Amino acid sequence: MTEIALIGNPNSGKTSLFNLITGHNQRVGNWPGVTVERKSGLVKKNKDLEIQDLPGIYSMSPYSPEAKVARDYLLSQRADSILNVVDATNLERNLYLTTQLIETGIPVTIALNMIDVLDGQGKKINVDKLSYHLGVPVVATSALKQTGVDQVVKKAAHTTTSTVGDLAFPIYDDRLEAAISQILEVLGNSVPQRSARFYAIKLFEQDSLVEAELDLSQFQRKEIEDIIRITEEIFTEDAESIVINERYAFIERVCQMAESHTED
Numbered sequence: 001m002t003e004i005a006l007i008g009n010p011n012s013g014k015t016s017l018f019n020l021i022t023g024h025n026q027r028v029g030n031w032p033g034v035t036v037e038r039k040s041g042l043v044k045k046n047k048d049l050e051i052q053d054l055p056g057i058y059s060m061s062p063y064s065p066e067a068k069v070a071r072d073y074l075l076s077q078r079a080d081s082i083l084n085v086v087d088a089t090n091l092e093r094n095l096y097l098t099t100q101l102i103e104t105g106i107p108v109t110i111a112l113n114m115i116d117v118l119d120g121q122g123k124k125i126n127v128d129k130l131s132y133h134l135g136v137p138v139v140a141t142s143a144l145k146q147t148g149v150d151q152v153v154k155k156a157a158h159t160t161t162s163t164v165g166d167l168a169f170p171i172y173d174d175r176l177e178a179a180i181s182q183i184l185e186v187l188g189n190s191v192p193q194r195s196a197r198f199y200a201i202k203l204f205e206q207d208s209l210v211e212a213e214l215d216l217s218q219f220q221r222k223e224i225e226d227i228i229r230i231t232e233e234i235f236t237e238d239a240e241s242i243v244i245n246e247r248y249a250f251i252e253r254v255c256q257m258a259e260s261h262t263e264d
């Protein structure tokens, strides 16, 4: 059946949503790191959908074994849809992960959760603008007030690897895009086609996990090493910082659009 993965920072309301969606009473708690293993369940309002609760994760270069369970689930290619649960009150921080999720090529739908806390803070987010600039569907949800939950599941079900055509990725500085294209050429079929961009950017960043997982030839490694060196000279910066700063810069732009109330 259709597999929907709940992915997002710890303490963002993933399990709270899962409980509402499935009828389960899985562990929910007011600190990061409550869920520690995968839990499956059927969506109650549509039994053709299976949803997976997973440990929280801050980055796809993860900081804990628990987060690595979420990462490895996604890179195993089992999910048809990512339901990215985003804490609306800490948007910028949460979108760091989001950018990497979009790059996997598994279609992303955002549950913009804890919208009730944002409402209580006297703040708002332009959901249509956020969606437009991020290139993914966005539904405002509250697991507390039980709003938007059935809507975001329906959207996630409709936003699948089988229904979505050409996927729209976050576009960075064209000097980085050039290096990404070069790395993709070198990789060829050495990575799954759907997630190739994710892996190419991780190779540029010289991510240890990804370098260990991919069985790249000496030839490929030498050409990638050369592409990174050339690009660092162009940027006048190290590779790791180039990518971090480009993600940050992208998120900054999108968030100033999400804060924008003025009609356009």
Ligand SMILES: CNc1ccccc1C(=O)O[C@H]1[C@@H](O)[C@H](n2cnc3c(=O)[nH]c(N)nc32)O[C@@H]1COP(=O)(O)OP(=O)(O)NP(=O)(O)O
Residues within 6 Å of the ligand: 008, 009, 010, 011, 012, 013, 014, 015, 016, 017, 027, 028, 029, 030, 031, 032, 033, 034, 035, 036, 054, 055, 056, 057, 113, 114, 115, 116, 117, 141, 142, 143, 144, 145
């Ligand atoms: C009134 N409720 C709260 C308001 C603010 C902060 C905590 C709570 C709190 O008493 O506790 C729970 C929630 O009640 C609350 N919570 C979840 N959704 C919402 C929401 O929409 N709104 C509010 N106010 N709280 C929410 O957020 C907390 C995390 O939920 P979790 O489901 O455990 O999150 P993960 O599964 O992502 N975590 P991990 O990755 O490590 O498994």
Ligand SMILES: [Cl-]
Residues within 6 Å of the ligand: 056, 057, 058, 059, 061, 062, 063, 064, 067
């Ligand atoms: Cl992490």
Ligand SMILES: [Mg+2]
Residues within 6 Å of the ligand: 014, 015, 016, 027, 028, 034, 035, 054, 055, 056
């Ligand atoms: Mg949880």
